[PDB]
């Protein structure tokens, strides 16, 4: 066997059924309208149509064999798969698409391939494959733009075929609007026919005009209706493409709008040029190191377990270096990485100063932190990445010298990225982990005697 829809082989068959359906949506109407296209390459079109019908029959076999989810589980019982496939509208559309209409080649001649319009009813396979591709590709917006561009190409090609067919019904060369006479050697070539029809359909759908005006009421009706198609349907697709291109830039546009709002606020308040330059440097650091994206808003819809799975892989290198996590039991990390808030500090920033209230502890993800004196001109010792600080004034140290006050000045040299862990978030993990609390109290009481 039973093919998993989430599996890779189902995607491979989705592509392998999309190729003949895309062939049918393009070439069947072209062969039906451009009779020279069907007549000249009849062997090639017969081979391609028979291959497409064989692939349709293998898609029959796959649709009877692909699984469907029932109460979460993927059921693999054959009769259940058969009944589920047959009960759907998909089976009816597919079996109407695969009726043997090729037997009507004898009744209507070999120049009538418009009896294969039933084969377009496998469009659901195209849309399903395009939905599955956009989920699993690394560039979803680019593929979406290409898909809508191809929809434009299909609509333009179909309008070209329709215009050629209407010129055929009215008569070539009878009017200045229709396609010219085939008896002209230049306009009698099949390439000229298709390419001029594509030109007419392109200019008409895009509402450029600059084409010979209709001289017949049916031509006026078709031109009005197809201008309306180009307005309602085509221009909507072009607007969707523009919206998708804007959605590529959406995070960058939002971040630049934040920058513009902050600069406009700072321009009104007559802030000094040094602070404006500092804020500009901070935002240039944010974009240059690509820290504009935030973890909270992107992963806001995720469950806690899957956010924990992601946050471990993001902070793999940091959480091995820390003495609290992944050194003894590695148990509280899966519960506590959700409580960590990443914060980035500018060079020279004082994170916590002596005599200040301690509402959080810090874990150094990146950067080099230094402990300094009251003036801060010199540094006592430097703290590398992976370490942690600011835990003295958080938990209840027995016999504390000051208590709930910072015992050291923390100077941030360079741009240090480091996690934040507040009071109650830390207590809601320490109450369930008394052993982890004791290890922190030990080093806290060991370092507080100085």
């Amino acid at each position: 066997v039973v093919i998993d829809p989430s599996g890779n082989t189902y995607y491979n068959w989705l592509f392998c059924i999309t190729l003949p359906v895309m062939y049918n949506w393009t070439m069947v109407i072209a062969r039906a309208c451009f009779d020279e296209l069907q007549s000249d390459y009849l062997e090639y079109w017969l081979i391609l149509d028979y291959v497409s019908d064989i692939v349709y029959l293998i898609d029959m076999f796959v649709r009877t064999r692909t699984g469907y989810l029932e109460q979460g589980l993927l059921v693999k019982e054959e009769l259940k798969l058969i009944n589920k496939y047959k009960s759907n509208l998909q089976f009816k559309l597919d079996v109407l698409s695969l009726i043997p209409t090729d037997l009507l080649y004898f009744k209507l001649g070999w120049n009538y391939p418009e009896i294969r319009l039933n084969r377009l009813l496998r469009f659901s396979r195209m849309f399903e494959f395009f939905q599955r591709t956009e989920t699993r590709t690394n560039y979803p917006n680019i593929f979406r733009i290409s898909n809508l561009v191809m929809y434009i190409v299909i609509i333009i090609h179909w309008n070209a075929c329709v215009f050629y067919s209407i010129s055929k019904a009215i008569g070539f060369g009878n009017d200045t609007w229709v396609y010219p006479d085939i008896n002209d050697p230049e306009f009698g070539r099949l390439a000229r026919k298709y390419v001029y029809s594509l030109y007419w359909s392109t200019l008409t759908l895009t509402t450029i005009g600059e084409t010979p005006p209709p001289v017949r009421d049916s031509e006026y009706v078709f031109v009005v209706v197809d201008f309306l198609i180009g307005v309602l349907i085509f221009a909507t697709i072009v607007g969707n493409i523009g919206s998708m291109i804007s959605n590529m830039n959406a995070a960058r546009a939002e971040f630049q709008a934040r920058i513009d709002a902050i600069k406009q606020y700072m321009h009104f308040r007559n802030v000094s040029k040094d602070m404006e330059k500092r804020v500009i440097k901070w935002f240039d650091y944010l974009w240059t190191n690509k820290k504009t994206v935030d973890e909270k808003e992107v992963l806001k819809y995720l469950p806690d377990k899957l956010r924990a799975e992601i946050a471990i892989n993001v902070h793999l290198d940091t959480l091995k270096k820390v003495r609290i996590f992944a050194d003894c039991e590695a148990g509280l990390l899966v519960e506590l990485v959700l409580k960590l808030q990443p914060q980035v500090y500018s060079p020279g920033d004082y994170i916590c100063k002596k005599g200040d209230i301690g509402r959080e502890m810090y874990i150094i993800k990146e950067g080099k932190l230094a402990v300094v004196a009251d003036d801060g001109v010199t540094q006592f010792v430097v703290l590398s990445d992976g370490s942690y600080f600011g835990e003295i004034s958080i938990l209840n140290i027995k016999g504390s010298k000051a208590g709930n006050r910072r015992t050291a000045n923390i100077k941030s040299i360079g741009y240090s990225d480091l996690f934040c862990l507040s009071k109650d978030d830390l207590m809601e993990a320490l109450t369930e982990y008394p052993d982890a609390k004791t290890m922190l109290e030990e080093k806290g009481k060991q370092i507080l005697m100085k």
Partner: protein, 434 residues
């Protein structure tokens, strides 16, 4: 039906559709009869017959149907016939109907131009057809393109009027008189309002002024209607676009940090099954927009019988179950994902909505001791501990895509202290489990 509520009673919606058909006939056909010479004396009687039918529809609307529309006054539905008539006569709808039914005997078809003032019925029918029809985004598209077609229709009528004023074939710009008048004037209106161009140049001053104003009105009104239609088709796929945007932002975040594909496929699959089993990602986003009473209503129907049929909430107080579902949030668990960890601490109690979870225990684990289907509760035991005293007795692995409900630590206990008898009943049923 001596009293009809405007919202329900689809027969009133059908009658209002008939009134809309009469109003659309007036809006679309008077500019034709005013401009085009389609009101010939050969077929004047058919024109007047359908005009009389539309006037009869208007009269039946103003008398028979609008005076039977029940209304709310003082917070109460009013059914008495005389009060409905007084409320209707006081309302703006009666003023619009009386102004729309002005008697113009005096033939000039522009005398029936007041009949287009009955657009309140059209707005009411739009509201009903967008309220009683599921997935009514397609009707908004049809309505907006009907506005666009009506604008092109009015422009075609104005073009034919200008041509007839100028001589009807005197110059290349005006209508030359050959072929069908309406479709060729509509062709001019299409290549003008869409601002395609490709038309004969206007020669005289009146024609250039008309072409200027027509291109100007095209550039503004065409942009208005296409902006409305793009906004309509964007709101039609607004939830899908938002879900795709969130999924792409998440995928970009995981791609940035070189997260392995084994986790990326899990996240993608979780988004796919959440969109296929909930339809709008986070349910609480729509829950917060509703009143608390409607939260209780939309909870008491879909996921109340499944949580009251469990083996643990039997014999309890029935109002706790009402208080149960304001804090129950659904979550999707992937197949072979550990819902419960034996060595880890327990924050949450789980109630299966649609899925199967398997409890593993015994020698070295990996033995399905019991399988819990939909309508079952697991993970309840570890909540009743102080400071996380109790761990999970056995690890639980979801067999498939399990959708299930959540109650956090110190969240069930917020509503458990309100019910002491239910508190001790849950304590007893937890004792029997251990």
């Amino acid at each position: 039906p001596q009293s009809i509520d405007p919202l329900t009673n689809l027969m009133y919606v059908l009658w209002l559709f008939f009134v809309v058909m009469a109003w659309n006939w007036n809006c679309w056909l008077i500019p034709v009869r005013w401009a085009f010479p389609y009101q010939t004396p050969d077929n004047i009687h058919h024109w007047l017959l359908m005009d009389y039918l539309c006037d009869l529809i208007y009269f039946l609307d103003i008398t028979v149907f609008q005076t039977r529309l029940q209304f709310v006054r003082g917070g109460d539905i009013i059914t008495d016939k005389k009060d409905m008539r007084n409320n209707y006569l006081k309302s703006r709808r009666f003023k619009m109907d009386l102004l729309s039914l002005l008697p113009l005997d005096f033939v000039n078809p522009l005398l029936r131009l007041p009949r287009c003032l009955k657009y309140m019925a059209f707005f009411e029918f739009n509201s009903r057809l967008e309220s009683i029809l599921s997935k009514a985004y397609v009707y908004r598209v049809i309505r907006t393109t009907a506005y666009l077609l009506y604008s092109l229709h009015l422009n075609s009528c104005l073009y034919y009027w200008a041509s007839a004023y100028q001589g009807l074939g005197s110059t290349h710009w005006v209508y030359d008189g050959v072929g069908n008048s309406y479709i060729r004037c509509y062709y001019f209106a299409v290549k003008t309002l869409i601002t395609i161009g490709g038309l004969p140049d206007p020669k005289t001053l009146f024609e250039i002024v008309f072409q200027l104003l027509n291109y100007f009105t095209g550039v503004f009104a065409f942009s208005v209607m296409i902006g409305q239609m793009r906004d309509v088709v964007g709101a039609a796929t607004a939830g899908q676009t938002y879900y795709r945007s969130c999924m792409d932002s998440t995928v970009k975040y995981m791609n940035f940090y070189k997260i392995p594909k084994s986790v990326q496929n899990r996240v993608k699959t979780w988004y796919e099954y959440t969109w296929h089993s909930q339809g709008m990602l986070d349910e609480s986003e729509l829950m917060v927009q509703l009143p608390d009473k409607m939260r209780l209503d939309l909870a008491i129907d879909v996921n109340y019988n499944i949580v009251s049929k469990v083996a643990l909430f039997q014999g309890c107080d029935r109002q706790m179950i009402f208080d149960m579902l304001k804090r129950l949030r659904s979550v999707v668990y992937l197949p072979n994902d550990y819902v419960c960890k034996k060595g880890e601490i327990g924050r949450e109690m789980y109630i299966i909505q649609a899925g199967q979870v398997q409890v593993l225990g015994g020698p070295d684990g990996k033995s399905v001791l019991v399988t819990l289907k939909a309508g079952s509760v697991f993970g309840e035991i570890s909540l009743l501990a102080v400071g996380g005293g109790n761990r999970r007795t056995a690890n639980v692995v979801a067999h498939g895509f399990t959708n299930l409900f959540i109650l956090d630590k110190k969240d069930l206990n917020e509503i458990l202290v309100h019910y002491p008898e239910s508190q001790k009943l849950l304590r007893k049923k937890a004792r029997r489990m251990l």
